[PDB]
Amino acid sequence: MSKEIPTPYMWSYQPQMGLAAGAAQDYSTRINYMSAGPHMISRVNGIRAHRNRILLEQAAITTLTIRGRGIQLNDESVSSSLGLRPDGTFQIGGAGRPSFTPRQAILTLQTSSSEPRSGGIGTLQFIEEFVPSVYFNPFSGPPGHYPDQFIPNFDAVKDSADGYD
Amino acid sequence: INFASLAPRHGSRPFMGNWQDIGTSNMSGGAFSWGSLWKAWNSSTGQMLRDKLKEQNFQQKVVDGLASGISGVVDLAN
Amino acid sequence: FASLAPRHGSRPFMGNWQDIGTSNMSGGAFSWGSL
Amino acid sequence: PTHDVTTDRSQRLTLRFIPVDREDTAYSYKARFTLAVGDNRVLDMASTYF
Amino acid sequence: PTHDVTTDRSQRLTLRFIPVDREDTAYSYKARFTLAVGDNRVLDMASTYF
């Protein structure tokens, strides 16, 4: 309500694309003090101010035996045991000792993707980045100066995405 | 870490296939080549047998495995 | 270069260098597409 | 190519797995196999067929 | 000899292994076993017998 101690706005996540959907004022955690006197009402307003101070600030400032993949594996290069190879004479029966070659096997097992991505955001980074945002003087500018990110039906490039096509 | 030695050699040069070939297909928008191109009440005998022969064999254009045939022109049925 | 080529544009119409060819019945073929 | 493409050691091509356990009913029956793929091998499931 | 010959820990003398796979064909019979030799043991296959 008050343009100085405003109820905060809480973002909504779209898991599927990784972008952040529209947000809204928090409407599930409001305190109903409509049956209180000036004392508790001032106390509650001070509490909400403290909460807003916590939010603003937070947001602004805070932004051998390799483990393999959780089960370590040993590593040997000269562990070659069966030195024979079947020439015209020999006939090698069942064999095989699985050993990770130091350079070939391990590096080929831990290479990253060929080219890094460029798109949406995962859940953890969304939680760390999109804290609830406190909007102080709501919509106080001329048309076009409003925060359009809040409306979920608004597309950044093509403005005001017409629902239903 | 080079796997060229595994490939067939087309003569001093590995036969490395195009990297742009990894499968993707769904219900609509995905189309693949090699389409379904194709007591006689009637005794003609002739064209009949011939037609049966035709029915069991094939022809198209991207069938370019190996060679198209001598002098040329580029054509359709892509 | 060559001026002896059909020109479909100012640029000439020339095929791939690698065009010379072989097949033995063998199955020494059974090989893939032009693509 | 010559090397690093085919295993010289004795190895099968068409493995045959037998049903470890089988259940029956008046309308349907169940068959359970213990598919094994030893090391230095790769199995393409497309070839598998009951 | 007194020591370093026979274990004092509870260890079996004879082990029998139940088949894991079976097949009764019209002209054969295939049986499969999971021969398990635990540590601190050595098995002389001459002892084994179907």
Side-chain angles (χ1 to χ4, degrees), chain A, chain B residues 1-67 69 72 77, chain C, chain D, chain E:
Chain A
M1 181 71 175
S2 299
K3 308 180 180 184
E4 305 177 6
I5 319 212
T7 14
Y9 268 88
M10 285 187 180
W11 293 99
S12 165
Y13 187 64
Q14 153 63 226
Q16 293 176 4
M17 312 175 48
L19 276 72
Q25 286 209 4
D26 133 69
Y27 63 114
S28 52
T29 73
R30 288 188 189 179
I31 289 185
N32 173 14
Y33 60 67
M34 198 53 65
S35 301
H39 227 170
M40 319 194 73
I41 219 288
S42 70
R43 175 71 163 180
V44 166
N45 278 334
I47 285 165
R48 284 179 181 181
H50 187 21
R51 173 196 180 188
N52 270 307
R53 279 185 301 162
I54 275 185
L55 243 24
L56 247 179
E57 168 179 347
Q58 154 168 130
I61 58 178
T62 297
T63 86
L64 263 65
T65 76
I66 299 95
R67 327 129 303 186
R69 258 165 298 100
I71 285 187
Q72 337 292 80
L73 286 145
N74 262 19
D75 191 6
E76 266 280 348
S77 60
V78 295
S79 169
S80 188
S81 59
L82 199 51
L84 238 307
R85 70 187 186 282
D87 306 86
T89 60
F90 286 79
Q91 175 176 301
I92 288 183
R97 166 54 184 175
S99 177
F100 270 12
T101 71
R103 181 177 181 170
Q104 292 270 344
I106 289 183
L107 291 179
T108 322
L109 184 144
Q110 286 179 0
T111 33
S112 58
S113 46
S114 181
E115 290 201 11
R117 213 181 63 84
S118 48
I121 315 178
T123 306
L124 287 180
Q125 189 152 2
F126 162 78
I127 302 168
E128 188 175 18
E129 185 155 331
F130 281 41
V131 298
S133 62
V134 40
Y135 195 20
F136 266 151
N137 300 38
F139 303 74
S140 181
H145 286 40
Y146 311 139
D148 284 327
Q149 335 300 323
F150 281 3
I151 317 184
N153 317 11
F154 184 93
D155 192 356
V157 271
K158 39 177 291 187
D159 316 15
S160 172
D162 277 25
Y164 321 133
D165 166 70
Chain B
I1 30 188
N2 182 24
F3 290 88
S5 60
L6 272 41
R9 300 186 75 196
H10 207 71
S12 68
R13 204 176 69 254
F15 208 114
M16 309 291 290
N18 298 325
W19 60 75
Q20 310 168 339
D21 301 332
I22 282 87
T24 287
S25 66
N26 239 77
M27 187 36 62
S28 58
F32 199 89
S33 53
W34 335 111
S36 166
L37 61 165
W38 312 125
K39 333 154 297 190
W41 343 319
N42 157 248
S43 175
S44 295
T45 76
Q47 187 64 7
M48 170 172 295
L49 307 189
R50 256 185 302 270
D51 268 9
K52 310 187 57 174
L53 220 202
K54 183 53 189 174
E55 268 183 351
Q56 302 145 182
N57 255 297
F58 68 105
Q59 187 60 299
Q60 255 178 37
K61 206 223 89 57
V62 265
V63 293
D64 292 339
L66 302 172
Chain C
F1 247 145
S3 72
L4 30 135
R7 293 227 174 190
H8 293 305
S10 292
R11 306 145 180 176
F13 181 64
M14 297 179 75
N16 215 345
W17 219 60
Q18 30 250 14
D19 274 357
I20 355 263
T22 196
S23 64
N24 309 346
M25 195 16 157
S26 319
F30 293 153
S31 64
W32 56 270
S34 58
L35 288 169
Chain D
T2 78
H3 54 58
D4 304 2
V5 183
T6 305
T7 159
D8 48 5
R9 302 184 166 171
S10 177
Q11 179 166 354
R12 278 295 193 88
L13 290 188
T14 305
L15 273 190
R16 169 170 191 262
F17 297 78
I18 7 193
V20 175
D21 161 47
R22 180 177 172 190
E23 305 301 326
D24 280 9
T25 331
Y27 309 110
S28 55
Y29 80 140
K30 170 173 186 171
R32 165 175 154 269
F33 304 92
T34 302
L35 186 61
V37 175
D39 295 70
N40 316 22
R41 272 211 185 109
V42 273
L43 169 62
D44 189 327
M45 284 297 303
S47 72
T48 78
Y49 66 105
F50 301 87
Chain E
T2 79
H3 47 26
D4 298 325
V5 165
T6 306
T7 162
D8 47 1
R9 312 205 159 198
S10 177
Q11 168 163 1
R12 268 286 191 85
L13 283 183
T14 290
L15 277 186
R16 58 166 300 163
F17 300 89
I18 275 303
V20 45
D21 298 357
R22 289 171 185 169
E23 158 176 309
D24 188 3
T25 330
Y27 313 89
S28 298
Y29 193 87
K30 177 157 194 169
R32 176 176 178 191
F33 303 97
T34 308
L35 194 61
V37 188
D39 306 53
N40 316 13
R41 303 168 163 183
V42 285
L43 172 58
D44 189 325
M45 284 293 305
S47 162
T48 77
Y49 64 101
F50 295 80

